[PDB]
Write a structure and sequence with these properties.
It comes from Rhizobium meliloti (strain 1021). This is Probable phosphonoacetate hydrolase. One of its GO terms (molecular function) is metal ion binding. With about 425 residues, this protein is of the alpha/beta class. It has two domains: about 300 residues, Alkaline Phosphatase, subunit A, CATH 3.40.720.10; about 110 residues, Domain 2, Phosphonoacetate Hydrolase (Gyrase A, domain 2), CATH 3.30.1360. Helix content is about 30%, strand content about 20%. The chain has 15 helices and 19 strands. The chain has a seven-stranded mixed beta sheet, with helices on both faces. It has a four-stranded antiparallel beta sheet with strand order 13-14-16-15. The structure holds zinc ion (2 copies). One zinc ion binds next to loops.
Length: about 425
């Protein structure tokens, strides 16, 4: 008998004998887990680490949710699947088209591939925007797929999500978007699906609300991870093979006084090339939002035709806090990004600084706590923990967060 596999985007996935699960702990800087484990709050993960496989992996750059969740879902980088931010920019129109519609995804997900091969597949997200993207190609007419968000759990229908009202089904209220509870609902749905639905493949992904607000080891951060550990214990005890990873880590991005340390790239280009001659894009946000959940450490810029690129890069690189400056071609090769969805230049800032657009008229402040964020190389390193013995599992830089399902199903086989 030859072995059974499903091939997706050039990678061969063995058929999982037990359920294969990947858990994306959004914004889980490895230090969060170390501190909660050290506080005695994660007995299940502590034991799983001792008996299983413990690694660090590299996320995709830019280290944001959309490119990374979709890389995990397809097992491929954004050069393959097409999702490299929250919105695309049309130069010869001035259009900022949203990149949350599934029409923008250019490669099949592992979920569809297994579904089409006859598997039972489940996808649960905290936020609904990711839901439609991650759910692309799934069908709900054979009782073999479930895909919904905590955010819109009460809107789920059999015909479009594979379940009639996930909130009523789970027995929990729709959580607040800005809460740890939005993530807890994902974990609880995951356990209940594992028991009652018995997926071959399941993806659980959360949000980093808690992590943007609280540093590793503080009471509110510890409580979140203590909470996760209880659901992890249950998933593990039910016999699934599990990879725990993250879309990106999390670092403090603030000066000593507790205020944001920001380099305003639009101002710098407006000054060197003329106002609005160039366009700076910040992939973390949807551009029409005036709250500091729009500050990250990665930026791309569309430059006026004919201008001296090589010169403009030199000036940006000479600024303290600007770590990496690369042309389209080089940035795309190095970070594995699609050339048709990136600016002429790519910028990555240093560990404690972010990148903004402009200062005149200015953006607005949101919450009390000092800024914590991601997007750069300094939030690329993430946990990658498997509840099975896997001595051949690579480490970073070879191991990527988007190797999660590859090794989950390998373990499960
Ligand atoms: Zn995230
Ligand atoms: Zn975030």
């Amino acid at each position: 008998m030859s072995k059974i596999s499903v091939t997706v985007n050039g990678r061969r996935y063995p058929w999982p004998r037990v359920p294969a699960i990947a858990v994306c702990l959004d914004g889980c800087e490895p230090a969060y887990l170390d501190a909660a484990i050290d506080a005695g709050l994660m007995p299940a993960l502590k034991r799983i680490k001792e008996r299983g496989a413990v690694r660090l992996a590299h996320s995709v750059i830019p280290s944001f949710a959309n490119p990374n969740n979709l890389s995990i879902a397809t097992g491929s980088p954004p050069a393959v699947h097409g999702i490299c931010g929250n919105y695309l920019y049309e130069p010869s129109t001035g259009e900022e088209v949203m990149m949350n519609d599934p029409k923008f995804l250019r490669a099949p997900t592992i979920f569809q591939a297994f579904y089409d091969a006859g598997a039972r597949v489940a996808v649960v997200t905290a936020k609904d925007k990711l839901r439609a993207l991650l759910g692309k190609g799934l069908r709900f007419d054979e009782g073999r797929a479930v895909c919904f968000s905590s955010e819109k759990s009460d809107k789920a229908t059999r015909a479009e999500h594979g379940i009639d009202n996930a909130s009523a089904w789970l027995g929990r209220p729709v959580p607040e978007v800005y809460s740890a509870a939005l993530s807890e609902f994902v974990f609880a749905a995951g356990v209940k699906l594992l028991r009652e639905f018995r997926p071959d493949i399941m993806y659980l992904t959360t949000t980093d609300y808690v992590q943007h607000k609280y540093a590793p080891g503080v009471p509110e951060a510890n409580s979140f991870y203590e909470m996760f550990d209880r659901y992890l214990a249950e998933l593990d005890g039910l016999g699934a093979a599990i990879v725990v990873t993250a879309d990106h880590g999390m670092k403090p991005k603030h000066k000593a006084d507790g205020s944001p340390d920001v380099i305003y790239v639009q101002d710098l280009l407006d000054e060197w090339l003329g106002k609005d001659a160039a366009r700076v894009i910040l992939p973390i946000t949807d551009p029409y939002v005036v709250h500091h959940g729009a500050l990250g450490s990665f930026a791309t810029a569309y430059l006026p035709d004919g201008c001296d690129r090589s010169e403009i890069m030199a000036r940006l690189k000479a600024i303290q806090g600007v770590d990496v400056v690369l042309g389209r071609e080089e940035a795309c090769r190095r970070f594995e990004l699609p050339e048709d969805r990136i600016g002429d230049i790519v910028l990555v800032s240093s560990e404690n600084k972010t990148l903004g657009t402009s200062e005149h008229r200015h953006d607005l402040a949101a919450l009390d706590e000092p800024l914590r964020s991601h997007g750069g190389l300094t939030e690329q390193e993430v946990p990658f923990i498997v509840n099975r013995v896997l001595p051949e599992l690579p480490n970073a830089p070879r191991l990527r967060n988007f190797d999660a399902f590859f090794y989950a199903v390998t373990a499960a086989a």
